[PDB]
Amino acid sequence: HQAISPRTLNAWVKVVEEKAFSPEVIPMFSALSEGATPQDLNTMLNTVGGHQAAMQMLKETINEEAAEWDRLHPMREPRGSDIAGTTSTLQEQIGWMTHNPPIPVGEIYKRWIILGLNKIVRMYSPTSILDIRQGPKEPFRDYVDRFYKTLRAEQASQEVKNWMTETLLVQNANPDCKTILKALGPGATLEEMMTACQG
Amino acid sequence: HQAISPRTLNAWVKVVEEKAFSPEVIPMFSALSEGATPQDLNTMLNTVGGHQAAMQMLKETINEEAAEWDRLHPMREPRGSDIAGTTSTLQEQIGWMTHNPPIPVGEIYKRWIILGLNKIVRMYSPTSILDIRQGPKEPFRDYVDRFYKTLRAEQASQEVKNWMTETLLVQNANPDCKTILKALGPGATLEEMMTACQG
Amino acid sequence: PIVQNLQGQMVHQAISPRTLNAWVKVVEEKAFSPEVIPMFSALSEGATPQDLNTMLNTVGGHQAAMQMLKETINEEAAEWDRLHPMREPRGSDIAGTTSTLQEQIGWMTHNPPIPVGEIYKRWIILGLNKIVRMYSPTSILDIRQGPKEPFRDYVDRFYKTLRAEQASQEVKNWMTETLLVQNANPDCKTILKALGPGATLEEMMTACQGVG
Amino acid sequence: PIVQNLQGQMVHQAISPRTLNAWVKVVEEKAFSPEVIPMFSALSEGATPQDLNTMLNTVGGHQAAMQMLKETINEEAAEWDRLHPMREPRGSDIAGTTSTLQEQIGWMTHNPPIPVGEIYKRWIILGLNKIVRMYSPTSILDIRQGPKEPFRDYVDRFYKTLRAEQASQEVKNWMTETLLVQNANPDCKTILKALGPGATLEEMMTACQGVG
Amino acid sequence: PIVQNLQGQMVHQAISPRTLNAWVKVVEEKAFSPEVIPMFSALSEGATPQDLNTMLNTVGGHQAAMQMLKETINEEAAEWDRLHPMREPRGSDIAGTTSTLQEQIGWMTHNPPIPVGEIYKRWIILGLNKIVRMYSPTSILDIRQGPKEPFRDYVDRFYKTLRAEQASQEVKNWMTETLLVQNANPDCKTILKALGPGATLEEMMTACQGVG
């Protein structure tokens, strides 16, 4: 066991401040927090500047997951608060991690944090994808890039997302690209759509 | 034992000069000062640039905590001044930390510095949590961000902060959103609250 | 009332003068508000029919109220005689006009007890409920929250008028559920309807705190 | 209550009619202010569960308050039965609905005593605290000193609202320390902040005498 | 209190519920005016330390007042222990927190009597005097006769504020002699100074009848 290096905290702060809570911060958090105890995760989340409403969402989600863990699971065994790093201590956490088999309180807490971060990203989505419409001059590549960005941020289910990509993307296109998309018709990959909709 | 590298001091200087004394400075100080002697802590505190009023406040708080330690407590026994590093050597500080059992003079000094930094953070936070109020035209997201930043800088007990989160957020909202928040009622989560108050 | 002798023989204990004075103050000063029935029940605890008649003698100053109290007592006595044809206490004898004190003490001390005092008390309370219903300054449909009135004061007025109204229990439940919301001012009524149906009085009160 | 016989055998002493009338006056006139709980404690000193039920029968006029008083009593009885599985007094029997008088007298006279009356009194006081919390006209955050209001009157209003609020003890301490100063008018608030943190209520009152 | 048995053995007589209710009404309604100390003395006549503690339990609703009442009681108990080093009643045992009832009855019934109840009553009255001093709306120097105020009303306000002030006796004498005249309005003040020094309150009142 080694204490969290400063450079990881600097990287976490930098990515959070530069990317906001965009969908790409989840993998960055997951990679930075590799092998991190609940104390380290708490320090990482405390270093975040701004976005304190989002941090409140995250800790509310952690509370919900801790309550669910306590409901499902009625040395000392770890409870939801212990896994969250509130009532437990560093020695207990690292002991649980080093037990054979390991009791990875860090990984479970990281899963809870990832769920809360996904909720944060969905809430921080600037606009609903129903309002993402191609302008009368915007290129199809730019419009569709924005569309799939909003779709990734919205985190809709796969079955719904298939319908959205199939129909809504075509329906929201501007009249010229709209006509070319009808001419292409269904069953066409996005490769065909964008290579045919050029200019 | 190893003397602190210049990278740690450069990181401390960078975070202080960039973020000022925001609540996120506390975890950064805690992470940077891991396993640090009082001499290392004094060097880290000396490397700071401006905010000399804040540094004087930290000195005063450390003096108060040293007086309290001397009152509590009637190789050589470490006193408050010895903990502060004014009347102690690096060798004596390596002592009491390599001692069997150890009395971690470094951790106590870090705790006093953390108390002083909490006081400085509250001083640098301009407005009181009771005074944080939603503007008539302000978005609820911005208002909640300001509210939770101020609350994190508020420096009160945890139960008190829980009560503040429960009550003051609804109490201080503008009349346009306060009626919606009352209709939601107690028990509504923050995600529900800021989805409802999106308009 | 009735108390035990040193030898255990139950004997009369007349209602004290200041208890009667308290009853007189209730009758004269309260103007037959709903609270006179709780106060009549309190001041006449374990009272014999003779004690109840002594209490009614002070109500006797009010001619109309006394006359309909007497008429309701007579109706209830007739109903008791119809349904219930020392000796068995006759319905007229429950009122104490005919019976003597020792018969009443014997009936209340019987094994099992014959609570004649409680029965006459219930008849008197029925008559007082009628009188209270008459003297209500306004009907429940007329209670309305003002623009400035706090929801607590309006709720108190509404529930006092509901006590005076004395409708059926299901009707009262509907009234508290719907008419309470209907008569609130628009500022409170918005939150009242936002809470939706089924809200208890506690939620309704807490949500409307300081809205006025 | 319970009193000694001439031979030392403990016997019932029913709550007097005027004590019940005082309780009825408290319930009807005070509109469930915080002071009803001290007054309920005073008027029901050394009272058996039967006496407490007699007192609650007068509260019964208020439908909502009685219903949640009953629900809180039931919850506390269930908790007592869970934690505590003549005979041992069952939690439902502490309420007196099932038990008879002699069992209650025996339990309160036991060596060591089984204060069933005090337990039922505590449950009733919990329910009355809930009712008092509901009926508060304003929240503690809404109490504000006016430009003319003396600091004494404002402090009295603040502390009465604090009693109605019934937050945690640490929360109450923070409230009295900080929110009391925050809500004072600027003329007093200047002196309040000049005194600095840690000032007791005595210093705060003396320094702000006649400032308005 | 304490009463004689039929056989002459002194036994406890608990403070009645309505006396406690009267004390609660005094505490809640009067807002700690000077009159609470006479009323506390009246309602606690011949009271044991247990009875005094029962009375203080109702004051306990007011957090600050209870806390400084307790602190003054502790200070007086410490002073008693310092000056006074069954057994001899310890100063902490005068408060009744440690002692039991029979010890208190024995001490109050001793030959010569050990008035422990009166001593604890004096300590409580000292604490209540402190609380009364705090809650005074204005200082004695701020009491002033208005242009229309009769001299009788102004004198009553002045003397009530003097009771709340609780300065030294010589200081109080000087205040009544000089400050009472100084604060009167010019119409009355002319006659007040014309009477000259040494005028008793009777002459001062009679001469200023109807002057306003």
Author numbering:
A (entry chain A), B (entry chain D): 12 to 85, 96 to 220
C (entry chain C), D (entry chain C), E (entry chain C): 1 to 85, 96 to 222
Paper text:
Finally, we extended our lattice templating approach to understanding the interaction of the capsid-targeting antiretroviral compound GS-6207 (lenacapavir; marketed by Gilead Sciences as Sunlenca®) with CA. We determined the structure of this compound bound to SUV-templated CA lattice at an estimated resolution of 3.1 Å. Consistent with crystal structures of cross-linked CA hexamers bound to GS-6207 (45, 46), we found that the compound binds to the ‘FG binding pocket’ between the NTD and CTD of adjacent hexamer monomers. Importantly, this site is also targeted by FG motif-containing host cell proteins CPSF6, Nup153, and Sec24C. GS-6207 density was completely absent from the pentamer, indicating that the compound binds exclusively to hexamers. This selectivity appears to arise from spatial constraints imposed by subtle conformational differences between pentameric and hexameric CA as the FG binding pocket is altered in the pentamer by a structural “switch” between NTD ɑ-helices 3 and 4. Work described in the accompanying manuscript demonstrates how this remodeling also prevents binding of FG motif-containing host cell proteins CPSF6, Nup153, and Sec24C to pentamers.
The mature HIV-1 capsid is composed of the capsid (CA) protein arranged in a conical lattice of hexamers and pentamers. CA assembles into a conical lattice formed by roughly 200 CA hexamers and exactly twelve CA pentamers, the latter of which facilitate lattice curvature and closure around the viral genome. Monomeric CA consists of two folded domains connected by a flexible linker: The N-terminal domain (NTD) faces the outer surface of the capsid, where it stabilizes the hexamer, while the C-terminal domain (CTD) forms dimeric interactions that link hexamers together.
